[PDB]
Design an enzyme around this catalytic site. Structure first.
Site, short mmCIF file in Angstrom:
data_model
loop_
_atom_site.label_atom_id
_atom_site.label_comp_id
_atom_site.label_asym_id
_atom_site.label_seq_id
_atom_site.Cartn_x
_atom_site.Cartn_y
_atom_site.Cartn_z
CG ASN A 203 112.10 -18.27 37.32
OD1 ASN A 203 112.22 -19.39 37.83
ND2 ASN A 203 112.65 -17.16 37.85
CG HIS A 323 116.26 -7.35 38.99
ND1 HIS A 323 115.25 -7.45 38.05
CD2 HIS A 323 115.65 -7.57 40.20
CE1 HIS A 323 114.08 -7.60 38.67
NE2 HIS A 323 114.30 -7.72 39.97
CD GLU A 370 115.66 -10.92 40.37
OE1 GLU A 370 114.66 -10.75 39.59
OE2 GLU A 370 115.52 -11.09 41.62
CD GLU A 379 126.01 -17.86 34.06
OE1 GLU A 379 127.09 -18.18 33.48
OE2 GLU A 379 125.35 -18.72 34.74
NE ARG A 482 111.87 -5.08 49.07
CZ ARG A 482 111.83 -6.18 48.32
NH1 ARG A 482 110.88 -7.10 48.54
NH2 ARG A 482 112.78 -6.38 47.40
CB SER A 574 124.80 -36.42 71.30
OG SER A 574 125.19 -35.36 72.16
CG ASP A 610 142.57 -9.48 55.58
OD1 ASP A 610 141.90 -8.59 54.97
OD2 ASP A 610 143.73 -9.84 55.20
CG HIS A 633 126.25 -19.62 54.70
ND1 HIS A 633 125.99 -19.88 56.05
CD2 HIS A 633 126.82 -18.39 54.65
CE1 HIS A 633 126.39 -18.83 56.77
NE2 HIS A 633 126.87 -17.91 55.95
C1 LIG Z 1 106.17 -15.81 51.12
N1 LIG Z 1 107.27 -15.12 51.80
C2 LIG Z 1 106.74 -14.40 52.99
C3 LIG Z 1 105.40 -13.64 52.96
C4 LIG Z 1 104.79 -13.02 51.84
N2 LIG Z 1 103.60 -12.35 51.96
C5 LIG Z 1 102.99 -12.26 53.17
N3 LIG Z 1 101.80 -11.61 53.41
C6 LIG Z 1 101.23 -11.57 54.68
N4 LIG Z 1 100.05 -10.93 54.87
N5 LIG Z 1 101.79 -12.14 55.77
C7 LIG Z 1 102.96 -12.81 55.68
N6 LIG Z 1 103.52 -13.39 56.78
C8 LIG Z 1 103.63 -12.91 54.34
N7 LIG Z 1 104.78 -13.56 54.17
C9 LIG Z 1 108.01 -14.23 50.94
C10 LIG Z 1 107.73 -14.20 49.57
C11 LIG Z 1 108.45 -13.35 48.72
C12 LIG Z 1 109.45 -12.55 49.22
C13 LIG Z 1 110.11 -11.57 48.28
O1 LIG Z 1 110.41 -10.36 48.81
N8 LIG Z 1 110.23 -11.77 47.02
C14 LIG Z 1 110.78 -10.76 46.09
C15 LIG Z 1 110.97 -11.51 44.75
C16 LIG Z 1 111.77 -10.64 43.82
P1 LIG Z 1 111.80 -11.10 42.16
O2 LIG Z 1 110.37 -11.23 41.60
O3 LIG Z 1 112.53 -9.91 41.22
C17 LIG Z 1 112.69 -12.58 41.95
C18 LIG Z 1 112.14 -13.58 40.89
C19 LIG Z 1 113.14 -14.71 40.50
C20 LIG Z 1 113.55 -15.49 41.72
C21 LIG Z 1 114.40 -16.71 41.37
O4 LIG Z 1 114.28 -17.28 40.24
O5 LIG Z 1 115.14 -17.19 42.28
C22 LIG Z 1 110.78 -14.18 41.34
O6 LIG Z 1 110.56 -14.38 42.56
O7 LIG Z 1 109.95 -14.52 40.44
C23 LIG Z 1 112.02 -10.02 46.51
O8 LIG Z 1 112.84 -10.73 47.04
O9 LIG Z 1 112.27 -8.79 46.29
C24 LIG Z 1 109.74 -12.58 50.60
C25 LIG Z 1 109.04 -13.44 51.45
CA LIG Z 2 126.99 -20.46 34.43
CL LIG Z 3 116.16 -5.98 47.92
ZN LIG Z 4 112.96 -8.06 41.43
ZN LIG Z 5 110.12 -10.00 40.02
#
Ligand SMILES: CN(Cc1cnc2nc(N)nc(N)c2n1)c1ccc(C(=O)N[C@H](CCP(=O)(O)C[C@@H](CCC(=O)O)C(=O)O)C(=O)O)cc1
Ligand SMILES: [Ca+2]
Ligand SMILES: [Cl-]
Ligand SMILES: [Zn+2]
Ligand SMILES: [Zn+2]
Ligand SMILES: *[C@@H]1O[C@H](CO)[C@@H](O[C@@H]2O[C@H](CO)[C@@H](O[C@@H]3O[C@H](CO)[C@@H](O)[C@H](O[C@H]4O[C@H](CO)[C@@H](O)[C@H](O)[C@@H]4O)[C@@H]3O)[C@H](O)[C@H]2NC(C)=O)[C@H](O)[C@H]1NC(C)=O
Ligand SMILES: *[C@@H]1O[C@H](CO)[C@@H](O[C@@H]2O[C@H](CO)[C@@H](O[C@@H]3O[C@H](CO)[C@@H](O)[C@H](O[C@H]4O[C@H](CO)[C@@H](O)[C@H](O)[C@@H]4O)[C@@H]3O)[C@H](O)[C@H]2NC(C)=O)[C@H](O)[C@H]1NC(C)=O
Ligand SMILES: CN(Cc1cnc2nc(N)nc(N)c2n1)c1ccc(C(=O)N[C@H](CCP(=O)(O)C[C@@H](CCC(=O)O)C(=O)O)C(=O)O)cc1
Ligand SMILES: *[C@@H]1O[C@H](CO)[C@@H](O[C@@H]2O[C@H](CO)[C@@H](O)[C@H](O)[C@H]2NC(C)=O)[C@H](O)[C@H]1NC(C)=O
Ligand SMILES: *[C@@H]1O[C@H](CO)[C@@H](O[C@@H]2O[C@H](CO)[C@@H](O)[C@H](O)[C@H]2NC(C)=O)[C@H](O)[C@H]1NC(C)=O
Ligand SMILES: *[C@@H]1O[C@H](CO)[C@@H](O[C@@H]2O[C@H](CO)[C@@H](O)[C@H](O)[C@H]2NC(C)=O)[C@H](O)[C@H]1NC(C)=O
Ligand SMILES: *[C@@H]1O[C@H](CO)[C@@H](O[C@@H]2O[C@H](CO)[C@@H](O)[C@H](O)[C@H]2NC(C)=O)[C@H](O)[C@H]1NC(C)=O
Ligand SMILES: *[C@@H]1O[C@H](CO)[C@@H](O)[C@H](O)[C@H]1NC(C)=O
Ligand SMILES: *[C@@H]1O[C@H](CO)[C@@H](O)[C@H](O)[C@H]1NC(C)=O
Ligand SMILES: *[C@@H]1O[C@H](CO)[C@@H](O)[C@H](O)[C@H]1NC(C)=O
Ligand SMILES: *[C@@H]1O[C@H](CO)[C@@H](O)[C@H](O)[C@H]1NC(C)=O
Ligand SMILES: *[C@@H]1O[C@H](CO)[C@@H](O)[C@H](O)[C@H]1NC(C)=O
Ligand SMILES: *[C@@H]1O[C@H](CO)[C@@H](O)[C@H](O)[C@H]1NC(C)=O
Ligand SMILES: *[C@@H]1O[C@H](CO)[C@@H](O)[C@H](O)[C@H]1NC(C)=O
Ligand SMILES: *[C@@H]1O[C@H](CO)[C@@H](O)[C@H](O)[C@H]1NC(C)=O
Ligand SMILES: [Ca+2]
Ligand SMILES: [Cl-]
Ligand SMILES: [Zn+2]
Ligand SMILES: [Zn+2]
Lengths: 694, 694
Positions: A203, A323, A370, A379, A482, A574, A610, A633
């Site tokens: 997306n 997800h 997700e 939601e 992970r 400052s 708490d 935050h």
């Molecule tokens: C760019 N950086 C740092 C990075 C990446 N590659 C690298 N390589 C080298 N060699 N060296 C590096 N320093 C390096 N650094 C990132 C990028 C992505 C992640 C990440 O972990 N991503 C997934 C995504 C899970 P998803 O696909 O299910 C979520 C979805 C929807 C998200 C939404 O709509 O809000 C999407 O992203 O399309 C997760 O969090 O599990 C974390 C760090």
């Molecule tokens: Ca909503």
């Molecule tokens: Cl995770």
């Molecule tokens: Zn995912």
């Molecule tokens: Zn994904």
């Protein structure tokens, strides 16, 4: 005995393997019948495993799909309007899946429809600094051009927002082998690299935490009032489509205009990486034409919510969520996480069947949609926000368990650092060469802390996963873990097959984790964190760790401002109030820790539990950050330039960013000072939640 | 024995009389040295009375004062620019005070400076419906005119906002004898009526809950960033000044133009009450000229905060607060309340000295700068919002104890109705003719409920007092009580001497409560409520009473909409979701009440006490009401037309108000439907906080 060790020992690699296989035989795209059937399967199994209740919570949210009878593609068109080259209509399916139906073709979810024709400009990764370089240094104007950008470095929705603000009339995203092809490894099916015909779905929204585009602030239930599409949150205004590197090479090879400004702009294809605009002399009358026909549609989604009621504090919730929806088979993302959650539910259910219950309530979630913007988790949190904010102890995410086979990766609130260190010292390392050593020992050796000797790296939370609502909107302590790659010796982005048809069960079983030992280690980390949070008499949070990091982040933001010493003098800027607040937080946290160690009194205990639970909550500002009301935050927000990255003191950071380019410095530095005041006040207010209560 | 009866019996009318005398010998205007000295006196005495700690909490907030060497006044000027009549520069001081210094002359706090000259238009009470009548029915245009309006009916800041939006270039406020002179009673000093030279001071801000104009959202502490004046919240844009009825008669007697539209526009002066614009034929070249020179100034204010720590639940706070600052002597407002709080602190301190402590913590507050916009209470709540929202049980206000001598007046959340009924059945009535009967019995007889037989009237909370931040912003259950007049047999507004130099100790001792028996009764009601809230094992809130009122308010708002049946058909406007939510709330509240009665387990108890405490909190929407971010309670807000009045389902009410005049009905009725959805969702979400927790 029913203790953490009993829980951990019941977890089995072979069960995680069976569940992964079961979850990845067909696609589970959000909003489709196959994903609803899997929700009902998980609901039935969690009940059989022993949970007290397991329900489906459904919502009707805006999703996006290609049109099955009018496919998306890009052309090069000649002067007569003939399409002389077309990009692919689908990825070649992997062996044995060439007859699987319902594989969604590559597309960028939420793209508007359009057939824009124009000249190409290559914009590198389409980051804020890439556009600064084009506009300010190279004097290249993207207005009315189609931009082509390589995936990598930042969230793809930030690339699209940046191209839109540069005036682009369309965006083409592509996977460059520099970022998605590791040297010396073969393409799928013979290795774990991206083939030239592979494409990354995903997306392209910019929701800033809102959830369903049509119902920001409120659950998308049966009587919800919905915004009209024109008022929806986060939708892009120009068409976008992703392609693989065989097709990218045909669009890039003819590029003319200006040379790339430097080597950081060159990928690995055999092309010049000229920036444009348009094609070299012989082809200067050729143009690029997109054809996007995807549609946005309100569609029903289903979260599965399982409850294991607490024995003593049933009104305190520890949440393990991840997800279920995938772009295609989801062999890593998310099913390598979902299989781990399923085995964790099974192991807790085995203890429950023997008469055990945890101290606090545990909630288990299988989130939907997700991939379309964190929609299911957000939601549900909107519907349940009052319960969550008064009762939520912690949220542990459970997306992909593996993205490599090298070492552990943890991102979490400082409140959980001590918990993670202590737990990993009790777990066995799965790594070759560390047989008989702890996970802490292998992790610390492979991923040292930049700050401390004999400590491992733990990163800030950013966004781009389902903890976002819980942490950045509601202020519930959150964490994730992970297995990952060696970020040093690798130039590639994430894992190569991300969001492609090639991300299958076979990918995982053949190349990432044949013995399922890394999956089992991650199940031990995530399940052990849940166990300790739900069962420890005193919540396992150490406020002193927040004091240490707050000083680090205050030093960092002060260093950024101190690049502008003349303006700090002129406008009397400052940071003294922020350092004072951090000093007070450090002193008060130390005294609270002494009381927690020195305090039979269940009311003093809960009072003190708490204080621990509401500490993360104290960093929430109900007015939100500037123009991002759902990022509340004050210490952490997703970076305004890259949703995946966390930023510390985000209100002050964004007020300082590119400040030398602002036309009214007195106004700009006044907003820096306002954000310093908000940060110092919030840190002092959070500190005071840990003072004696009366 | 240390029980409620011991507390109540220790309270003495003679002590309240002594404290009132002590607090009303000199003016205590906010921001002045005399008010700081009184803060230090109260701090010292509360410590002597036995509180555990007593501190001053100070803030630097925008206040407003006349210029001592350039006085405010209004003239009639003739064609040559000669001022032929001037209004008074001060009120004639009452007997024995003619040498008292530092009496602030009448002025409207926060008026801008200006010397506007023009023709007068008389606008009755300057209510929304008075301006509708002038503009829509009479075709009179106020643009560029000075308006003259009588005090009464609505908060004076709403009158000024209404005049500003009508295009006025200045406002003159005056006290008409119709509204401030009760027939058959003599003017002060010989009776309790307003003399012709008396004038009502008062602020004219429209803050909508923001607190200090310069720091909305954040306490006005030493490092606060302040808005510039041009961006401040709530300041009027046209000059405003109040006068008495001798001066008003000189400005009104020459009025010409149109006759008053009907008798509801005529007061009691011997003038025609013509609406204007301007003066009759002979005087048509004369104009009115204001001269306002007051200045806004950041000034330090001081709240006194006393703590009596709880024995069992010290992290649960019951707050008794009222203001200390007055316009002049404050004989009723606020010192008749402050004297009652002082005697309540003394009585609790007597129990404490004998070894007793309440179950929960009690906080006692003497607020500053209430008269300038609720500034002291709001700044303190902004500073302490995280403590208050997680720990605040209830807030009991303590402004004026008497505004008449007829019967009790209570305004509170439905959660406190049962508590008030039960407490007043145990208290003695002070009323002549009810000797030996309960306060409940005299109150119910004199002020019957409109809805129920053998029940007394209890009103909604509005605003215009220090509970506003606690109730409407933070969602802490709040209540107030005082003695009042017979609202039936009287046509006058509040009490006649309100905010005048004549509101003295002698006024109270001679005419309102010579024996201090009504003050003692009010001390018993306020102190008894505090005692029960801080000491009852189960919090004394009845959720079923909220269910009953929610149905009443849903019936009411539906009835308003049903005046527009064609539009409800056209735009499919249904209240079904709101009635469903109210039905669910009623069912779930009934089941929760059964568990509360049927549940030795301190954790089930606290769990259930937290469900009771967070119920008011559940009606808060973090996004606030439209354009009023600090009014966050979905069921109650101050009326948009009159800050003193509460409105139920305010988001839906304001969406329906004057909807037939909106130019785009589809947009207007869409916003009605959005507000119905927000209300139904919030009621259902609040109900679900009372369901079983897991
Ligand atoms: C760019 N950086 C740092 C990075 C990446 N590659 C690298 N390589 C080298 N060699 N060296 C590096 N320093 C390096 N650094 C990132 C990028 C992505 C992640 C990440 O972990 N991503 C997934 C995504 C899970 P998803 O696909 O299910 C979520 C979805 C929807 C998200 C939404 O709509 O809000 C999407 O992203 O399309 C997760 O969090 O599990 C974390 C760090
Ligand atoms: Ca909503
Ligand atoms: Cl995770
Ligand atoms: Zn995912
Ligand atoms: Zn994904
Ligand atoms: C960190 O914790 C400390 C407490 O340990 C807390 O210290 C407080 O600092 C404030 C300053 O921000 C102090 O405020 C002063 O209060 C005194 C009265 O007690 C006033 O007289 C002072 O005002 C005078 O001086 C000012 C400065 O020159 C002038 O601007 C002003 O016009 C007055 O002349 C001032 O308000 C406060 O006393 C202490 N409290 C203590 C020591 O207990 C500190 O603020 C915390 N840090 C943060 C960011 O909250
Ligand atoms: C008051 O409390 C009751 C519970 O006692 C709660 O009832 C819920 O109402 C919703 C409707 O708002 C029901 O939602 C339905 O859920 C079923 C699945 O369980 C769906 O199949 C339904 O969708 C179909 O029908 C719709 C209506 O014709 C179509 O628009 C839709 O396209 C589908 O065809 C629908 O979503 C829900 O089942 C009950 N839950 C119960 C009975 O437990 C009610 O909502 C509460 N009131 C408020 C204001 O919250
Ligand atoms: C108009 N209605 C109803 C009404 C009044 N008079 C009537 N007569 C007959 N006969 N019949 C009637 N039906 C009637 N009805 C009101 C008006 C005012 C009150 C109210 O009680 N007011 C004070 C005010 C205390 P304050 O002075 O210290 C607050 C200050 C600042 C406020 C701010 O800035 O927000 C200010 O108002 O200037 C308080 O709440 O104690 C409540 C009801
Ligand atoms: C995944 O596992 C589930 C659970 O074992 C399988 O669903 C069961 O299938 C059998 C045979 O069709 C049915 O009799 C059961 O009712 C199902 N149980 C459920 C749905 O809880 C499912 O077939 C497996 N899927 C794959 C692709 O292997
Ligand atoms: C992580 O483990 C350390 C070492 O056991 C725990 O710190 C000890 O806590 C005990 C029990 O309160 C104290 O008496 C010790 O003095 C602490 N030792 C230290 C600080 O070195 C620590 O609390 C654990 N962290 C958790 C559970 O979050
Ligand atoms: C109001 O009462 C207070 C408390 O009794 C009086 O202040 C005391 O005055 C005496 C004589 O000046 C001093 O010795 C005490 O130190 C004061 N006590 C305090 C301030 O706590 C005050 O004089 C009275 N005010 C009026 C107007 O009667
Ligand atoms: C007000 O008093 C009534 C009458 O005593 C209280 O209601 C009773 O509460 C007792 C104790 O739980 C129950 O066993 C009775 O059945 C209730 N009687 C009724 C409802 O008529 C009521 O709880 C009190 N309200 C408070 C304390 O807020
Ligand atoms: C998909 O394309 C087909 C074929 O041209 C068309 O009939 C239909 O309207 C489209 N479906 C949509 C827009 O959902
Ligand atoms: C590209 O597809 C279009 C649309 O079907 C078709 O007209 C054209 O011939 C194709 N071009 C090539 C080179 O295949
Ligand atoms: C970019 O190009 C368009 C011309 O079509 C123009 O509107 C815009 O101002 C240009 N911006 C520059 C040169 O900075
Ligand atoms: C797994 O580890 C081996 C040994 O370091 C490495 O050569 C291989 O590339 C890794 N597999 C993956 C998918 O990272
Ligand atoms: C008050 O009026 C005097 C006398 O004209 C003037 O000198 C002074 O500036 C004014 N004070 C203010 C505006 O605070
Ligand atoms: C009103 O006051 C002004 C200003 O001091 C003065 O010029 C005028 O003479 C006064 N008019 C009357 C009637 O007293
Ligand atoms: C009121 O008067 C002014 C004329 O100075 C004008 O600007 C305004 O539009 C008038 N409004 C009416 C007649 O509704
Ligand atoms: C007090 O009560 C008497 C008797 O009803 C009444 O005539 C008098 O006006 C009242 N005083 C005040 C100030 O209301
Ligand atoms: Ca403020
Ligand atoms: Cl009051
Ligand atoms: Zn008052
Ligand atoms: Zn007042």
């Amino acid at each position: 005995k029913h203790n953490m060790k009993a829980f951990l020992d019941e977890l089995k690699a072979e069960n995680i393997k069976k569940f992964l296989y079961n979850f990845t035989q067909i696609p589970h795209l959000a909003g489709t019948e196959q994903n609803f059937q899997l929700a009902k399967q998980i609901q039935s199994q969690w009940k059989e495993f022993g949970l007290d209740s397991v329900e489906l919570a459904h919502y009707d949210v805006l999703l996006s799909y290609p049109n099955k009878t009018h496919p998306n593609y890009i052309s090069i068109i000649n002067e007569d309007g003939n399409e002389i080259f077309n990009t692919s209509l689908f990825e070649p399916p992997p062996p044995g899946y060439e007859n699987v139906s319902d594989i969604v073709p590559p597309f960028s979810a939420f793209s508007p429809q359009g057939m824009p024709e124009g000249d190409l400009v290559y914009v590198n990764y389409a980051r804020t600094e890439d556009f600064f370089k084009l506009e300010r240094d190279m004097k290249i104007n993207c207005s009315g051009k189609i931009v082509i950008a390589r995936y990598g470095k930042v969230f793809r929705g930030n690339k699209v927002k940046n191209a839109q603000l540069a005036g682009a009339k369309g965006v083409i995203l592509y996977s460059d082998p520099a970022d998605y092809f590791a040297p010396g490894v073969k393409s799928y099916p013979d290795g774990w690299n991206l083939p030239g015909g592979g494409v990354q779905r995903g997306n392209i929204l910019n929701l800033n935490g809102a959830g369903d585009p049509l119902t920001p602030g409120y659950p998308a239930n049966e009587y919800a009032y919905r915004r009209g599409i024109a008022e929806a949150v986060g939708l892009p205004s120009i068409p976008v489509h992703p392609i693989g590197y065989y097709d990218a090479q045909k669009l890039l090879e003819k590029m003319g205009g200006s040379a790339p400004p430097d080597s950081s702009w060159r990928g690995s294809l055999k092309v010049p990486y000229n920036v444009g605009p348009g094609f070299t002399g012989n082809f200067s009358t050729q143009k690029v034409k997109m054809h996007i026909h995807s549609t946005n549609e309100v569609t029903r989604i289903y979260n599965v919510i399982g409850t294991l009621r607490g024995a003593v504090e049933p009104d305190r919730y520890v949440i393990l969520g991840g997800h279920r929806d995938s772009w295609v088979f989801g062999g890593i993302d998310p099913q390598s996480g979902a299989a781990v959650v399923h085995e964790i539910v099974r192991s807790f259910g085995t203890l429950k069947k023997e008469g055990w219950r945890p101290r606090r309530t545990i909630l288990f979630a299988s989130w939907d949609a997700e991939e379309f913007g964190l929609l299911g988790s957000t939601e549900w949190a909107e519907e349940n926000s009052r319960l969550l904010q008064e009762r939520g102890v912690a949220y542990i995410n459970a997306d992909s368990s593996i993205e490599g086979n090298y070492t552990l990766r943890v991102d979490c609130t400082p409140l959980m650092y001590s918990l993670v260190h202590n737990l990993t010292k009790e777990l066995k390392s799965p790594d070759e060469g560390f047989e008989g050593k702890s996970l802490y020992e292998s992790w610390t050796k492979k991923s040292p802390s930049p700050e401390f000797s004999g400590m491992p790296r733990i990163s800030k939370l950013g966004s781009g996963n389902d903890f976002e609502v819980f942490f950045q909107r509601l202020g519930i302590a959150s964490g994730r873990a992970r297995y990952t790659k060696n970020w040093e010796t690798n130039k590639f982005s994430g894992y190569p097959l991300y969001h492609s048809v090639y991300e299958t069960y076979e990918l995982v079983e053949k190349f990432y984790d044949p013995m399922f030992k890394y999956h089992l280690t991650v199940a031990q980390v995530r399940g052990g964190m849940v166990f300790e949070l739900a069962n420890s008499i005193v919540l396992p949070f150490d406020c002193r760790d927040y004091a240490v990091v707050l000083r680090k982040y205050a030093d960092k933001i002060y260093s950024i401002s101190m690049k502008h010493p003349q303006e700090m003098k002129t406008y009397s800027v400052s940071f003294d109030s922020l350092f004072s607040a951090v000093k007070n937080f450090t002193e008060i946290a130390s005294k609270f820790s002494e009381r927690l160690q020195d305090f039979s009194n269940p009311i003093v205990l809960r009072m003190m539990n708490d204080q621990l639970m509401f500490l993360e909550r104290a960093f929430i500002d109900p007015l939100g950050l500037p123009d991002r009301p759902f990022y509340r935050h004050v210490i952490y927000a997703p970076s305004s330039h890259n949703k995946y990255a966390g930023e510390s003191f985000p209100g002050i950071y964004d007020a300082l960013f590119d400040i030398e380019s602002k036309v009214d410095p007195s106004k700009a530095w006044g907003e820096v000072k306002r954000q310093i005041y908000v940060a110092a006040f919030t840190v002092q207010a959070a500190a005071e939640t840990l003072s004696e209560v009366a």
